[PDB]
């Protein structure tokens, strides 16, 4: 034996970058720092002017793109505000609060479905909306140092997961069968142009039940500007495809090759052919051009943006050569100019100047869009109106501008004495767009147009001066964004509907009502029976502060809850007075304030309201809500008369069941629920007093919750509720006083912990009563705050699920997220192609900044982290590879969808004793270097809490697990990147780690 | 009446509460555009002009953090090994350590960390270009949410330290002043009182030198931090506080003395007894240009060195004995330049009331010198920018400037910049500000440095490792040397010089110094506080120790932990060979008790880990080694046997004779609960067996999985335990995948078994156990275990009755070096109890002010009158009552302890006097919620939580989204519990009569 408690020098050497307690101030010269600094540089460089080659690079450049880890953190962050201003600031009124709520709960289907109900192009809009002049500009968290939520990145992600699940849209299932629809619904509707505006309008019309809807498009491709000009590196063409496949799911017909124009389609022909309504969504087809450019061609290198963008599109997109070398001048200050500037780099420009008429603060493009130009090392020339495109040699070679300025009233002039000669090869008119075409205008004869030569519409109804013809989108000249065009189709859709019905003799609601968005997921059954009660869904308010009053129970039933407990009430004699404060927040996960508290503590007593109030309540609630279960929670002292007098009273007022609150003192713990013989007897009393089911509610503050459960079963209870709160003390202030602190003496008493902090306790309770009394109905409670969690508890043996803290953290409306949540989890289970996901979470792509990190037998296993000079090299392998390189059918369930009753107790078979655990099938951890952000947490935690088995490279900060791994699994557990360390099977000799 | 229907008043109260929708909403695009302006929080692109900034010096930094923000951002940091942010900080700050103190609520440890490596830590927080420094290296840049706000964190912790008003002291490691070798009375001069010389002077003083003098030419001190950086990025009182820190060490400052041939020169210093000298005089002069010659400030012409120091002097109260006022600069202003100097000219101009500002650069946007935490300030004050214009002729039309003429510049295929002679621009203007940078040109100064070598650029040449000039006794750094660029580098220059000046001077007295540089850290009297505690007759040097767990797998870990400063460790639990076990894998997973947060600060872990797989031979030998080398750290051998009197007596004696200070009996084994520890008679017996086999103290480790933990603790004391460890982990199960499989999941069958939960999730449970045993068995010694992850939570257990503190999960979340936080945390916490001027602090946190992104919020007269929140047209109407006050106007004595500094023994169990039965709580003194509309951020959460979990007792105003708590509140306190804004809501005594309402009377 040598010195067992000193590390032999191999491990002395693996430990070399571990943290050590620091005892002097370090010594490093400014010159050495200046040199070291470049080795770890993550970012953008201002000692760098030629960033990478961009040419033929159409990969995603949005900064708001989120992967799953990222999207889960941002959604948790959001406050989920009442009457949210984000949604006030959204042109299409998306319920962001709900959809953000659902993301936080891993319900991507319910988020996506909320998103698409109010915007049928929610993905597109996720990607391109200028959120900072819309929803994000209104977010309450801008009032904090960390700032607004990335709402669009969240909208983007949920819809992207919903893309991947491959679920069709369906007809409004509320609606009658098709052959039973009134006749008005078969009127022919024509929409002109397949852009966001008509796609939106026909979707809503399809949703209302219209069966003969046709989109007539000029071009061969669909989607309007999102296809032909929004770049592929901000809006992938296949996002656009998928949103149109959704619309086509509802029966909308598209016909390409037929234009609104003289001797093609006109209003008058639309009339003779029997169309009843026409929606005009043709956009602004023509380029706002300057006279000085008259005569130049593409051969001399002149393009309008309507020449240029569609060409680059046709080349980087299944939509239908690129070649812009040298110095490029881009004229204009809107979105159009900024997208030419950046697609220029993609056909290989050496330099891109953007030149503005007016100045910097007059930039109209989407400040996100101005970002991409800045970081690509575009040049910005303010205050210069064009005058002369000098040509020589067949090719443009410069351009002569005049200076402009404004004379402290606010109007502009030009100084002829001052010109710039501006060497260039390509000039791109990027001013904007108009409707000029007279054969188009003729085709709308006779509607009125205004000054601007746009169709005039009433802006509330979208109707033109002909009442069968409507218009929306860019062509009306008010909307500048995709989400505003969509909202134009939305608004039009309802008044087209009012107009068509009236022509057939019928009238429509007074309050506009368009339908939500639907999928087959929504038809999934999620009722369950337990103790011979039918629950319309398995979620319920527990007996607790959300049921302080019976009008709140009323409001919760109308929001959709399946059942509720009354707050526990007692005979009169037994009535109690609360103290205040008595509900405080948990400290169970550090100093996070606001949404998502991991527990609360309460020292709250039973109801201050009387048995009379509560019985009369129960009767009013069961009269108006016959299919909602109402359980009456009651409490007495250890007293046979009381327990019989109170359970008969509750029963006769019409409760579906009782809950015995077993937290009363005795006179084997001090509360009744801590002693089996007392619980046995109480159950015997109640069982002989009433005929309805009753459940005993167990306390987890016991050595063996199984022997209280059984006692209840032996005493005749029809089930148990597991569990009530854990006894605890939530913490002390640094001078010693507690919180909650009552009176001027700052007194406290022990309280009950609730929330997700206690979920492991409750789950293990539920699991262990189910293995031991299998068959005996359990109602779970303790930290249920999504559908995924409820499902854990159902899997564990519970039949219905009681909720308290998740509603204190939010409001009765989570119920909508729990339902669509559970319908989604059960439906995915019938989808073969999606067997690799965990519930709604896809199999994880290898990501940094939640984007896919490439695959080339160079970058795979020659150690290149994403920083410093290695980064510089991955970006040269990736931008000489883009040099070199120059079917949608919905899944179908194949197994019927399971009911709740088919998933209850499924997990029970995987539990067991410790010696049913294989000690033969050992694992090692394994780190995916493409997924690693170089933190060294796996390393610090294997060193001071593990087996010193990870090498951490001092020059790359890449870790590597050695053959010493014992599969403890700590490293996986602390790693911030989801699915970066995987546990795999040991493949070489492990004997245990014995010491001498 | 229908009792289960709201009344009509309440139904009105409920108008804005959420409701599950059923219809897509209809709203015209035109209406949406009208309604958008009502809610807007931000500076809008419709919007041309700016606010009125004249005479407005209020902080504009985007990186300033209040306590809420700062705790959130420190918890986000991964606290990385070998951290690249620290590699990228020019003074090598230990970011990971200071950010872990902040996130453990120990601002004093943070601050001491910061000021140890950088004596201008607070300034550097405010002004560092951190995207080109520490923030540019952050690993979290590789995530969507991005890099950590290090500048911000460093700033907030240093402000809390500035507010505690604690002085620095002499490194208490030194011998007393008269035992010091004569070398340390060597006279040292430093030239210039900026960052470089403050840093250098400070580190020299740390080392023991008593006779240091900084000679300052001006009459203010601090160099450019004082004379040019504006007040609204770097307030003056921060500089004054870093200087005071320096003076506490005895550094002397003399103003109005110049390095100059007419005054101080290297000769008059050599002749008057200085043994060494540091040149940090910066770059005194502007970089002038010929086309401005002979144009004075009477004419609208300034250099940056004329302009900025006026703006300073009238906006920095405390800097001059002269009083003077803000230069008036109406009109259009041209700023020439694109570095730091120019952008501060451009914002300082808008405060002088310039009507419009244009920055004109010789080169491209792609070529700008300052640091986009700066350039950003000028874009959002609406300054205009003109690239590729170099100035030719300033046009002087009878007295005033009226214009400037320029030529377009561009690059050739050479890439070199040349000037199109004919393309000329005639920008009118009233004021011109050249902000090209600085030089040393003055020959009076060069000559006083004679004879050191100067280089091309005309600066003292130095050795860049040692900061030495060609004269071996004269050093130089900071701006004067041409490398430094930023304050923190100029600090580093002097830090680096200090140790070589130390080596130089000790040689000159005939001594040598270490090979490896060793500058002392930063100390204050807080570090001298004693935090040892005596327990069961053992003395602990500090009350923090490693629990029996994965962080004590191998005795070589315990060796490293003792070397990092842990007071004590348990071994993993071990047994006799016949009970040795085989472990499974996976066996330790992360909690789901706080949702899907990956990375730092997990709220719990689960484990299905058994006892050590190393044998009692290995362990017993280790305890001998360890006690051999660490006789002052306590080492407790954790042991386990079946219910068997011989085995327990033999194993406890084997661990006695190996040298252990104590034993911990782990009562988890099995044969009202299958484990020994769950039954009071089995515990009494196992404790009796051990008590009779050994004479050292031993502790029973109790499980919280029981009905009454007191009864088991009492069972331990009845059979002789010297105390109890409370508590082992909580029985539980961490969750299942959506397919019903478990995690952990072992082998091909993916089986699992019940496990134990650990970490801050079980603290309520362990605290209750500890306060329970402590009231029932007064004076019975307790070791506390269960969710201790900072000094602060640690003090909670001491207050609850514990003497010493076990840690596992917080080290699994991080590494052994948290101990340093715990120790400085707990000294800071005790010391602060003696500072009566801080009685309103809650430990190290200061009583809140009215924050809005961590900024003082207005306390005006009609503004506190009729309710105005921070968005839409109300934001504009405050911004207007914030251009009326700001156009209505156109120190550190250290605290002394006044009470003795508690020992640990003085705080044990003080929380017991507040704990009691429910019957002891007063129901006479009821409270109500009151809300501060200034701190409110308009979320609705207090409202929704009263609406669906409360008493419908808050009104949410439809236009302002401002809540008001109404007379029907019962104090339940949920709203205060859900508010995101720390101490916006406050629970106060009812003054009005209260009926606890009953439904039916
Ligand atoms: C403020 C509050 C009050 C409660 N009041 C009662 C009660 O009166 N009767 C009862 O059986 N449970 C009561 N409970 C317990 C809850 O019904 C529930 O069992 C516990 O909170 C754990 O579930 P949770 O994670 O969803 O909150 C209360 C909980 C809280 C926070
Ligand atoms: S000193 Fe500056 S560079 Fe260093 S961490 Fe602080 S802010 Fe960063
Ligand atoms: S204390 Fe309770 S009743 Fe009062 S306002 Fe807050 S939530 Fe409501």
Closest atom of ligand 3 relative to the B970 alpha carbon: 3
CA distance A406 to A359: 10
From A74, which residue of chain B is nearest by alpha-carbon distance?
A: B145
- CA dist B27 and B577 (Å) reads 77
CA–centroid distance, B200 to ligand 2, in Å, is 18
Q: Which residue has the tokens 């192609």?
A: A833
What is the distance in A from the centroid of ligand 3 to the CA of B951? 7
Q: How far is it, in rounded angstroms, from Cα B732 to Cα B762?
A: 11
Is the separation of the CB atoms in B700 and B665 below 8 Å? yes
d(CA B215, CA B253): 6
> Which residues 6+ apart lie within 8 Å of B476 measured at CB?
B278, B279, B280, B452, B460, B462, B467, B469, B497
**Peptide bond connecting B207 to the previous residue in cis, omega within 30 degrees of 0:** no
A583: nearest Cα among B917, B924, B974: B974
CB A735 within 8 A of CB B842: yes
Whether ligand 2 lies within 6 angstroms of the CB of B154 is answered as yes
Tokens, residue B446: 């060069």
Distances (CA, A) of A594 to A324, A783, A962, B278, B650: 53, 17, 42, 52, 54
Resolution of this model in Å is 2.1
Residue carrying the six token digits 């600031």: A89
- Do B387 and A377 count as a contact with CB atoms less than 8 A apart? no
In this structure, are residues B594 and B527 in contact, taking their beta carbons and an 8 Å threshold? no
User: 3-state secondary structure string, B301-322?
Assistant: EEEHHHHHHHHHHHHCCCCCCC
Tell which phi-psi region holds residue B912, choosing left (phi > 0), alpha (psi between -120 and 50) or beta: alpha
Hey, are the CB atoms on B618 and A995 less than 8 Å from each other?
A: yes
Mutation for B interface: A2, A14, A20, A21, most B CBs within 10 A: A21
**Cα A15 from Cα B560, distance rounded (Å):** 11
Separation of B762 CA from ligand 3 center, angstroms? 27
Chain-centroid distance, C-alpha B484:
26
Give residues with Cβ within 8 angstroms of B782, minimum separation 6: B723, B724, B725, B726, B770, B773, B774, B801, B802, B803
Query: How far are the Cα atoms of A97, A107, A295, A819, A828 from residue A823, in angstroms, in the given order?
Result: 20, 10, 62, 6, 9
Q: Is B752 in the pocket of ligand 2 (CB under 6 A)?
A: no
Ramachandran sector of residue A545 (left: φ over 0; alpha: ψ -120 to 50; beta: rest): alpha
Q: How far apart are CA B723 and CA B718, in angstroms?
A: 11
Residue ranges in B851-994 assigned as alpha helix (H) = 872-881, 904-907, 941-949, 974-978
Distance from C-alpha of B337 to C-alpha of B359, rounded to nearest angstrom: 7
H-helix or E-strand spanning residue A583: strand A583-585
Indicate the length of chain B as a whole number.
1001
Cβ B741 vs Cβ B720: under 8 Å: no
Tell the burial category of A24 from Cβ atoms under 10 Å away from its Cβ (0-12, 13-18, 19+): middle
Rounded Cα distance, A718 and A709, in Å = 11
Compute CA A955 distance to the chain's CA centroid, rounded to the nearest angstrom: 37
**Cα A209–A214–A217 angle (5° rounding)?**
145
Residue B336's DSSP bridge partners are B360, B434
* Site from A2, A3, A4 to mutate, B interface, most B CB atoms within 10 angstroms: A4
Angstrom CA distances, A929 to A939, A954, A974, B147, B347, stand at: 14, 15, 16, 20, 46
Q: How far is the CA of B927 from the centre of ligand 1 (A)?
A: 22
Question: Which of A81, A810, A933 is closest, CB to CB, to B143?
Answer: A933
**Is B280 within 8 Å of B259 (Cβ atoms)?**
no
Q: Which domain holds residue A619?
A: 528-829
C-alpha A443/C-alpha A804 separation (Å) is 62
Using alpha carbons only, how large is chain A's radius of gyration in Å?
Answer: 34
Least CA distance to A618: which residue of chain B? B4
Q: Nearest 10 degrees: CA dihedral of A101, A104, A105, A110? A: 50
Buried b vs exposed e over A158-181: b needs ≥16 C-beta within 10 Å?
Answer: bbbbbbebebbbebbeeeeeeeee
**Rounded-to-integer distance, Cα A808 and Cα A804, Å:** 7
What was the structure determination method? X-ray
Q: What are phi and psi of B791, to 5 degrees?
A: -60, -45
Distance between CA atoms of B461 and A625, rounded to whole angstroms?
89
d(CA B100, CA B113): 11
* Cα dihedral across residues B157, B163, B164, B168: positive or negative: positive
**Cβ-proximal residues to A858 (8 Å cutoff; 6+ apart), any chain:** A877
User: Does the distance separating the beta carbons of B68 and A593 come in below 8 Å?
Assistant: yes
Residue whose CA lies nearest to ligand 3 atom number 4: B969
Ligand 1 centroid vs A106 CA: distance in angstroms? 25
- DSSP class of residue B128 equals -
Cβ proximity of B107 and B506 under 8 Å: no
Residue A979's Cβ-side half-sphere holds a number of Cα atoms within 13 Å equal to 14
What span, in angstroms and rounded, lies between the C-alpha atoms of A398 and A395?
Answer: 10
How many Å apart are CA A71 and CA A80, to the nearest integer? 15
Interatomic CA distance for residues B919 and A908, integer angstroms: 43
Give yes or no for a contact between B614 and A994, defined as CB atoms under 8 angstroms apart.
Answer: yes
Q: What does residue B824 show for φ and ψ, rounded to 5 degrees?
A: -75, -40
- List B260's β-bridge partners, or say none: none
SS3 annotation, B376-445: HHHHHCCCEEECCEEEEEEEECCCCEEEEEEEEEEECCCCCEEEEEEEEEEEECCEEEECCCEECCCHHH
d(CA B579, CA B585): 20
Chain A positions touching B379 (Cβ under 8 A) are: 360
% helix, strand, coil for chain A, step of 5: 35, 15, 45
Cα-based distances in Å from B164 to A120, B126, B168, B239: 57, 19, 12, 16
In ligand 2, which atom is closest to the CA atom of B86? 5
Check if the beta carbon of residue B835 is closer than 8 Å to that of residue B942.
no
Q: What residues contact residue A211 under an 8 Å CB cut-off, 6+ apart?
A: A178, A181, A185, A186, A251
* SS3 assignment, position A991: coil
Contact call for residues A700 and A723 (beta carbons, < 8 A)? yes
**Measuring CA to CA, how many Å separate B26 from each of A639, A656, B20, B36, B223?**
59, 40, 16, 16, 62
Residue with tokens 């003056």, as numbered in its chain: B236
Q: Residues enclosing ligand 3, CB less than 6 A?
A: B 929, 945-946, 950-951, 953-954, 965, 969-975
Cβ atoms within 10 Å, residue A885: 6
Q: Which residue of A has its CA nearest to B43?
A: A137
Taking contacts as CB-CB distances below 8 angstroms, the residues of chain A near B707 are: 668-669, 674, 701-703
Query: Is B892 in contact with B240 (CB distance < 8 Å)?
Result: yes
Q: Pick from A192, A195, A226, A205: which is nearest to A491 by CA?
A: A205
In the numeric block, which tokens belong to residue B347?
Answer: 């914002």
- B595: nearest Cα among A941, A589, A112: A589
Chain B interface test: which of A13, A38, A108, A145 (most B C-beta within 10 Å): A145
> What are phi and psi for residue A558, nearest 5 degrees?
-65, -20
Helix (H, G, I), strand (E, B) or coil at B20: coil
Q: Do A91 and B29 lie within an 8 Å CB cutoff? A: yes
SS3 A141: helix
The two beta strands, B389-396 and B401-411, are antiparallel
Ligand 3: distance of its center to the CA of A583 in Å?
Answer: 10
Closest CA to B356 of B678, B802, B764, B48: B48
Report the distance separating Cα A902 and Cα B719, nearest Å.
53
A544 pocket-lining for ligand 1 (C-beta < 6 Å):
yes
Closest residue in A to B479 (Cα–Cα) = A30
Give the distance (Å) from ligand 1 centre to CA of residue A543.
6
Q: Which of B38, B42, B382 is opposite residue A132, by nearest beta carbon?
A: B42
C-alpha span between A740 and B497 (Å, rounded): 55
Distance CA B216, CA B197 (A): 10
Tally Cβ neighbours within 10 Å of residue B372: 15
Angle at A820 between CA A818 and CA A824, to 5 degrees: 110
Burial A845-871 (b: 16+ CB within 10 A, else e): ebbbbbbebeeeeebeeeebbbbbebb
- Count Cβ atoms within 10 A of the Cβ of residue A887 and give its class: 0-12 exposed, 13-18 middle, 19 or more buried: exposed
- Ligand 2 centroid vs B488 CA: distance in angstroms? 7
CB nearest A30 (choices: B425, B483, B591): B483
Domain of residue B608, CATH code: 3.20.20.70
Beta bridge partners of B25: none
* Torsion sign (Cα): B293, B294, B299, B304: positive
Question: What does the alpha-carbon distance between residue B641 and residue A862 come to, in Å, rounded to a whole number?
Answer: 51
What DSSP state is assigned to residue A840?
A: T
Contact A963, A988 (CB under 8 A): yes
Please name which of A957, A926, A929 lies closest in space to residue A860, comparing C-alpha atoms.
A929
How many beta carbons lie within 10 A of that of residue A991, not counting itself?
7
Contact residues, chain A, for B425 at CB < 8 Å: 403, 418
Q: Which residues pair with B394 in a beta bridge?
A: B404
Please judge whether A742 and B907 are an interchain contact, meaning their C-beta atoms are less than 8 angstroms apart. no
What distance in Å separates the CA atoms of residue B239 and residue B235, rounded to the nearest whole number?
A: 8
- B292 token code pair: 């401005």
Question: CA-based angle B894:B898:B899, to the nearest 5?
Answer: 140
Which of the listed residues A724, A761, A802 should we mutate to test ligand 1's pocket, taking the one with most ligand atoms within 8 A of CB? A724
Closest CA to B701 of B724, B721, B681: B724
Top mutation candidate among A540, A541, A543, A544 for ligand 1, by most atoms within 8 Å of CB: A544
Question: Starting from the edge strand earliest in sequence, which strands make up the sheet with A275-280, in order?
Answer: A253-256, A213-217, A188-192, A275-280, A469-471
Q: Which of A31, A593, A767 sits opposite B980 (nearest CB)?
A: A593
| Paired residues of A658 in beta bridges | A632, A694
Q: What torsion do the CA atoms of A671, A676, A678, A679 make, to the nearest 10 degrees?
A: 90
Beta strands in A6-104 (DSSP E): none
In angstroms, how far is CA B173 from the centroid of its own chain? 27
Cis peptide before A740 (omega within 30 of 0): yes
Task: Measure the CA–CA gap between A378 and A376, rounded to whole angstroms.
Answer: 6
> Ligand 1 atom 10: the closest Cα is on which residue?
A543
Cα dihedral B691, B694, B695, B701 sign: negative
Token representation of residue A553: 């129970």
Q: Is A763 in the pocket of ligand 1 (CB under 6 A)?
A: no
């Amino acid at each position: 034996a040598p010195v067992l408690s000193k590390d032999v020098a191999d491990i002395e050497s693996i430990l070399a970058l571990n943290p050590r307690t620091q005892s002097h101030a370090a010594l490093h010269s400014t010159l050495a720092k200046k040199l070291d600094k470049k080795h770890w540089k993550r970012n953008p460089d201002k000692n760098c002017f030629h960033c990478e080659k961009l040419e033929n690079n159409f990969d995603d450049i949005k900064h708001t793109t989120l992967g799953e880890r990222g999207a889960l953190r941002e959604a948790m962050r959001c406050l989920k505000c009442a009457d949210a201003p984000c949604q006030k600031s959204c042109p299409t009124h998306l319920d962001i609060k709900s959809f953000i709520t659902s993301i936080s709960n891993k319900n991507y289907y319910g988020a996506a479905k909320m998103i698409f109900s109010d915007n049928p192009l929610g993905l597109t809009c996720g990607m391109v909306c200028p959120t900072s002049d819309l929803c994000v500009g209104g977010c309450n968290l801008y009032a904090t140092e960390e700032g607004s939520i990335n709402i669009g990145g969240l909208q983007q992600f949920a819809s992207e997961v919903f893309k991947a699940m491959n679920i069709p849209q369906i007809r409004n299932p509320c609606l009658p069968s098709q052959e039973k629809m009134p006749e008005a619904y078969s009127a022919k509707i024509a929409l002109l142009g397949a852009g966001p505006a008509s796609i939106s309008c026909a979707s809503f019309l399809a949703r209302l039940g219209y069966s003969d809807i046709t989109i007539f498009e000029k071009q061969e491709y669909v989607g309007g500007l999102s296809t032909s000009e929004i770049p592929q590196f901000r809006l992938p063409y296949d996002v656009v495809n998928f949103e149109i496949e959704l619309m086509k799911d509802l029966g909308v017909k598209i016909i390409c090759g037929k234009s609104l124009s003289e001797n093609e389609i006109t209003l008058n022909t639309l009339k003779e052919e029997g169309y009843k309504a026409a929606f005009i969504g043709i956009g602004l087809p023509e380029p706002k051009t300057d006279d000085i450019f008259q005569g130049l061609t593409q051969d001399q290198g002149f393009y309008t943006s309507k020449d240029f963008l569609p060409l680059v599109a046709k080349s980087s997109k299944g939509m239908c050569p690129l070649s812009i070398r040298g110095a490029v001048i881009v004229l204009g200050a809107g979105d159009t100019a900024f997208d030419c500037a950046t697609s220029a780099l993609r056909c290989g420009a050496r330099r891109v100047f953007l030149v503005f008429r007016k100045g910097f603060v007059n930039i109209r493009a989407v400040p996100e869009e101005v970002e991409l130009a800045k970081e690509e090392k575009c040049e910005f020339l303010p205050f210069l109106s064009p005058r002369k495109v000098i040509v020589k040699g067949g090719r443009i070679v410069a351009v002569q501008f005049v200076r402009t300025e404004q004379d402290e009233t606010g109007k502009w002039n030009e100084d002829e004495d001052q010109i710039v000669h501006l060497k260039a090869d390509v000039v791109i008119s990027a001013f904007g767009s108009v409707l000029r075409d007279p054969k188009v205008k003729e085709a709308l004869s006779p509607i009125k147009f205004n000054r601007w030569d746009l169709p005039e519409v009433d802006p509330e109804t979208m109707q033109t001066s002909e009442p069968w013809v409507f218009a929306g989108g860019d062509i009306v000249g008010m909307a500048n964004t995709t989400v505003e065009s969509v909202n134009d189709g939305k608004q039009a859709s309802w008044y087209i509907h009012k107009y068509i019905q009236a022509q057939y003799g019928a009238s429509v609601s007074a309050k506009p009502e368009l339908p939500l968005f639907y999928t087959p997921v929504d038809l999934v059954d999620i009722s369950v029976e337990m103790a011979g009660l039918k629950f319309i869904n398995p979620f319920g308010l527990a007996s607790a502060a959300p049921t302080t009053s019976s009008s709140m129970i009323r409001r919760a039933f109308e929001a959709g809850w399946g059942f509720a407990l009354t707050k526990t009430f007692s005979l009169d004699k037994d009535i109690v007075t609360n103290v205040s404060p008595r509900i405080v927040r948990g400290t169970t996960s550090g100093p996070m304030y606001g949404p998502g508290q991991s527990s609360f503590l309460n020292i709250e007593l039973i109801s201050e309201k009387t048995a009379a109030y509560w019985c009369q309540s129960v009767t009013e609630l069961k009269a108006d809500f016959p299919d909602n279960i109402v359980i009456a929670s009651i409490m007495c002292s250890y007293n046979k008369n009381d327990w019989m007098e109170l359970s008969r009273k509750a029963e006769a007022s019409g409760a579906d069941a009782l809950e015995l609150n077993l937290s009363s003192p005795h006179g084997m713990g001090l509360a009744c629920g801590q002693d089996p013989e007392l619980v046995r007897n109480i159950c015997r009393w109640v069982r002989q007093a009433v005929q309805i089911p009753f459940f005993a509610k167990l306390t987890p503050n016991v050595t063996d919750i199984v022997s209280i459960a059984r006692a209840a079963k032996e005493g005749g209870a029809d089930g148990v509720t597991a569990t009530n709160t854990v006894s605890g003390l939530m913490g002390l202030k640094a001078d010693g006083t507690p919180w909650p602190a009552v009176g001027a003496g700052k007194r406290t008493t022990y309280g009950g912990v609730s929330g997700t902090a206690i979920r492991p306790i409750a789950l293990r309770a539920v699991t262990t009563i189910a293995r031991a009394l299998p068959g005996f109905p359990i109602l779970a409670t303790g930290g249920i705050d999504s559908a995924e969690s409820g499902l854990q508890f159902l899997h564990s043996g519970a039949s219905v699920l009681q909720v308290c803290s998740a509603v204190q953290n939010q409001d009765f409306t989570v119920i909508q997220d729990y339902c669509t949540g559970l319908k989604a989890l059960l439906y995915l289970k019938s989808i073969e192609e999606l067997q690799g996901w965990d519930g709604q979470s896809p199999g994880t792509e290898s990501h940094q900044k939640g984007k896919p990190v490439p695959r080339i037998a160079e970058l795979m296993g020659k150690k290149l982290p994403n920083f410093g000079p290695y980064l510089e090299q991955r970006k040269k392998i990736i931008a000489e590879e883009k040099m070199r390189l120059k079917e949608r059918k919905p899944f179908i369930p194949k197994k019927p969808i399971p009911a709740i009753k088919d998933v209850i107790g499924k997990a029970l078979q995987y539990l067991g004793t410790f010696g049913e655990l294989s000690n033969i099938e050992q694992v090692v951890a394994v780190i995916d270097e493409e997924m690693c952000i170089n933190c060294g947490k796996c390393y610090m935690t294997c060193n001071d809490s593990g087996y010193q088995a990870i090498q951490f490279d001092p020059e790359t900060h890449l870790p590597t697990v050695t053959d010493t791994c014992t599969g403890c699994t700590l490293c996986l557990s602390v790693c911030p990147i989801i699915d970066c360390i995987r546990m795999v099977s040991r493949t070489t000799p492990y004997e245990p780690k014995r010491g001498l």
